[PDB]
């Protein structure tokens, strides 16, 4: 396992440096230098905060993958809580961006009130509070074992049924619910774009709408393209748990390697907003 032992820390450190640099730059610029333009920038600020939290918690995972875990049960619980909060916050702030764009484009006459309220007093309730509440199993279950040699910092459910239940609800919520909301919103938006001669009532409003809309499409596509293979891997694993999939013992180790490598590569979602700012900031 030398290949994995050398591969994991390098990726966890590259992502860590890039996340610190990009997310710190974005947060400083849009929090103190006042470069915020519209509601999409507020949503991207919230995304940057969540990604900064996860990037801060990454080095502990790097050290854990290198040799061992010398940090403690409290730090194990903290890193698990931070990871879950970041995941559920980002995957749904994306859906809030999609809803904002749908309201802006489809109903362009009187969207100011349900475009201002939905971001000024509803984003917290819709994103952070369910994200905080979903971390109660992290408090209950996240622990540090004392197996031979190494110390393991993972979640130890009493029985495998809860393992499959938690995997299914994670997949369900964080891939399907924003997935369906984004599908509906962007299908309607794209159907509007290809048909309406002139959105709103002036050419400048039309071009502003298109220019604001496109980066969010690119961001959502990149996010889902990064996160999808990990979900495929854990879906195959869960179907291995339930007595459906059964092949030779080589399949188990192949799936373990696939899921580990793909999670390492899917942690790249934290570096998307700074990259899009770099691409579209000339």
């Amino acid at each position, epitope marked *: 396992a030398n290949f994995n032992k050398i591969f994991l820390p390098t990726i966890y450190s590259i992502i860590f440096l890039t996340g610190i640099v990009g997310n710190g730059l974005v947060i400083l610029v849009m929090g103190y230098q006042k470069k915020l333009r519209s509601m999409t920038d507020k949503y991207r600020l919230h995304l940057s905060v969540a990604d900064l939290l996860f990037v801060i918690t990454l080095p502990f995972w790097a050290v854990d993958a290198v040799a061992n875990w010398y940090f403690g049960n409290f730090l194990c619980k903290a890193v698990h809580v931070i990871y879950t909060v970041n995941l559920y916050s980002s995957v749904w702030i994306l859906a809030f961006i999609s809803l904002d764009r749908y309201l802006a484009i489809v109903h362009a006459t009187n969207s100011q009130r349900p475009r201002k309220l939905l971001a000024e007093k509803v984003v917290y309730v819709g994103v952070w509070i369910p994200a905080l509440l979903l971390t109660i199993p992290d408090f209950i279950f996240a622990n540090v074992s004392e197996a031979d040699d190494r110390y393991i910092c993972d979640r130890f459910y009493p029985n495998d049924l809860w393992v499959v239940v938690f995997q299914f609800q994670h997949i369900m919520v964080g891939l399907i619910l924003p997935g369906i909301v984004i599908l509906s919103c962007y299908c309607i938006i*794209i159907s509007r*774009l*290809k048909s309406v*001669r*002139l959105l709103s009532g002036s*050419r400048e409003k*039309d*071009r502003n709408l*298109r*220019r604001i*809309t*496109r980066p969010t499409v690119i961001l959502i596509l990149a996010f889902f393209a990064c996160w999808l293979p990990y979900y495929i891997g854990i879906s195959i694993d869960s179907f291995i748990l339930l007595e459906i999939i059964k092949q030779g013992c080589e399949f188990e180790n192949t799936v373990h390697k696939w899921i580990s490598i793909t999670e390492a590569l899917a942690f790249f979602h934290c570096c998307l907003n700074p990259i899009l700012y770099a691409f579209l900031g000339a």
Partner: nanobody
Amino acid sequence: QVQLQESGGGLVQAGESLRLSCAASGTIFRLYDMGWYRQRELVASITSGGSTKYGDSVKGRFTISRDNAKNTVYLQMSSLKPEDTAVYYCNAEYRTGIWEELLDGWGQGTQVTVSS
């Protein structure tokens, strides 16, 4: 970009029938409005939905048409008058992409002369 041309002009006797043409080809994502002008005197313009907006001086006089397959617009002329001897400019509104703004266009021009 896109290319638009005009044709159908020449020396024609009064009271004859002809059909002007204006074909657009190239990086076309969608054509929205296509019309003929004569400043900018709106004499005919057919939307993609067929809701034509004829001019006041040609009310009940000119007939317009459009072939979405060939991206062409046809102007059916009939009952020529000496006051109608002018040069017509093909005008069209197009778009080069989903995220691109509305781009206007113009044609080279066609001259129609009435014998006298």
